[PDB]
């Protein structure tokens, strides 16, 4: 019954809310899945504010 936790050194995206075909992150940010993947897996930059 007792669970534990790991403190990740950096934020990590949940794959269920990214790779499910109605992409919940893509549909919320209004970005295509390819752009989100390229940003997440360290292939391109994105401007924030």
């Amino acid at each position: 019954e007792r669970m534990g936790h790991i403190e990740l050194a950096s934020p990590t995206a949940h794959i269920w809310f990214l790779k499910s075909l109605p992409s919940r992150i893509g549909l919320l940010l209004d970005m295509p899945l390819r752009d989100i993947e390229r940003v997440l897996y360290f292939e391109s930059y994105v401007v924030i504010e």
Partner: protein
């Protein structure tokens, strides 16, 4: 404790899939922490972050973004999502269907002495299924003063634990189930009868509902425990409660193959049978004459029958009259319950004339008389089917005498049309269609000749002259009574097999003109194989 390590002989704690996926993530996280503390160049930290992301993604759902990481045997590791979803996940394997206690299984055989509310259970399986009940009954009556004393008594199988078992299985239904359970009649509750052996004895009449035959099938038995399960198995799931099909409303307890053969043989007539024309005083005299050998089962006689009919209020009024019947029908009339007419057995009872009899009994009388009637019908049918001494030989497949003339005429016609095509009068397709039509007509001619020859016979009349009656052929009786077989199988047995089809579906113009009483040559046996393999593959894949 939900992701345990596997202890195998040799002191080896092999790491499972989830622990490997956790160790990978922990290693990447610790490396990233140390590198971020050391102020490493951004290239290395970017690579470490990318690999940590990949490790977490592989942990949560392995293989969703390509290149699933594999173990030692080059097989992808199972993640949490693979443990939740699929046919091997929690939902479909541990929550919607489970393994249960108080359950066994074994091969089923037939018991013809049973009543359809009881089954036959081995006494070495019931000793294991009913063990806590035996402990309680043993220490209830002072035979054992402790749980371990009763445990030892059951372990060494003393001579009183069998009396205890017979007391504890007295009125306690058991659920018998055979997979696949296509409809709700695949699970039914029976009352056990302790038998000697290792095979379950199943009542014949309940075989149609289970779709079970005794050529290697197996059944599983479950024991209802609580006081509500024992009453649900008795008032809802009992075998004497479901005698109508919930799909269409028709009976499902119809006698099937050699219960109807005996009732067909018993209820028939012969032109000049032994001891015919005499006047009997009732069914009892008819049976006394039959057993004593003074009369035949098919002798036409006059018997004094009393029959009861229901009034408007529901009371039974009797009428007595002399019926013209046979000796075999008077003997069967002793089984029919009161309230049914005598015209219900004054005929040759096939398979459709027996189901309508049970349906009439159910609609007029009720449920208990129908159950008793079904059991008595099964007993009498078995007894007289055995007593008839029916068999099957190689002379029972009478080939028609005109078969070769018909085949020769068809061959002459096809040769003539072959020459006509050779002269260019007709197209190839038209010739093919006409040849197919010729062979289809020849097949029907052969079939009609064979069936006209098979279905009738001659017999010396009461006086010296002759007369014609229905055939007593063993195969014709099986086909005509609905016991087993149809017209097409008898046609293949005693007439030409006919036209065959290629796997594409196109008819081969040259047919198989040989039956199974005769042989098929090497070339005629190679097309029935196309047909048979198509038929087998269809079922195996559907």
């Amino acid at each position: 404790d939900l992701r345990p390590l596997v202890p195998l002989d040799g002191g080896r704690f092999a790491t499972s899939d989830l622990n490997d996926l956790y160790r990978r993530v922990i290693n990447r996280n610790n490396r990233l922490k140390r590198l971020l503390d050391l102020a490493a160049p951004d290239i290395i930290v970017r690579n470490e972050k990318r690999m940590l992301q990949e490790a977490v993604d592989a942990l949560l759902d392995n293989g969703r973004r390509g290149r699933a990481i594999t173990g030692s045997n080059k097989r992808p590791l199972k993640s949490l999502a693979d443990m939740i979803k699929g046919k091997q996940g929690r939902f479909r394997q541990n929550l919607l269907g489970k393994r249960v206690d108080y359950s066994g299984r074994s091969v089923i055989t037939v018991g013809p002495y049973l009543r359809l509310h009881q089954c036959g259970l081995p006494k070495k399986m019931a000793l294991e299924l009913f063990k806590p009940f035996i402990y309680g009954k043993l220490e209830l009556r002072g035979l054992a003063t402790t749980i371990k004393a009763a445990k030892k008594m059951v372990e060494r199988e003393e001579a009183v634990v069998w009396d205890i078992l017979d007391e504890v299985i007295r009125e306690h239904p058991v659920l018998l189930n055979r997979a696949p359970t296509l409809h709700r009649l695949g699970i039914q509750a029976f009352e056990p009868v302790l038998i000697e052996g290792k095979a379950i004895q199943l009542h014949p009449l309940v075989c149609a509902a289970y779709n079970a035959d005794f050529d290697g099938d197996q059944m599983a038995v479950h024991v209802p425990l609580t006081l509500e399960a024992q009453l649900e198995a008795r008032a809802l799931m009992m075998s004497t409660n479901n005698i109508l099909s919930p799909a269409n409303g028709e009976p499902i307890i119809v006698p099937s193959q050699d219960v109807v053969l005996g009732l067909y043989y018993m209820t028939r007539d012969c032109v000049n049978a032994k001891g015919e024309g005499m006047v009997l005083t009732g069914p009892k005299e008819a049976e006394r004459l039959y057993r004593s050998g003074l009369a035949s089962l098919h002798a036409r006689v006059k018997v004094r029958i009393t029959e009861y009919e229901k009034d408007a209020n529901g009371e039974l009024v009797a009428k007595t009259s002399l019926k013209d019947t046979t000796v075999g029908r008077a003997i069967l009339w002793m089984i029919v319950p009161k309230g049914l007419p005598y015209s219900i057995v004054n005929q040759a009872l096939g398979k459709k004339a027996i189901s309508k009899m049970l349906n009439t009994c159910y609609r007029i009388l009720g449920l208990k008389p129908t159950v008793i009637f079904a059991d008595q019908i099964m007993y009498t049918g078995f007894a007289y089917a055995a007593r008839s001494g029916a068999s099957v030989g190689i002379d029972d497949m009478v080939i028609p005498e005109k078969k070769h003339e018909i085949i020769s005429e068809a061959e002459a016609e096809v040769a003539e049309i072959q020459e006509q095509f050779q002269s260019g009068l007709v197209t190839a397709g038209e010739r093919y269609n006409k040849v197919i039509d010729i062979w289809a007509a020849a097949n029907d001619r052969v079939s009609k000749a064979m069936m006209d020859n098979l279905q009738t016979e001659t017999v010396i009349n009461r006086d010296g002259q002759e007369e014609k009656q229905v055939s007593f052929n063993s195969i014709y009786m099986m086909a005509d009574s609905g016991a087993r077989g149809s017209a097409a199988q008898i046609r293949q047995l005693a007439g030409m097999r006919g036209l065959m089809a290629k796997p594409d579906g196109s008819i081969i113009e040259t047919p198989i003109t040989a039956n199974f009483r005769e042989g098929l040559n090497v070339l005629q046996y190679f097309i029935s194989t196309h047909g048979a393999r198509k038929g087998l593959a269809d079922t195996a894949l559907k």
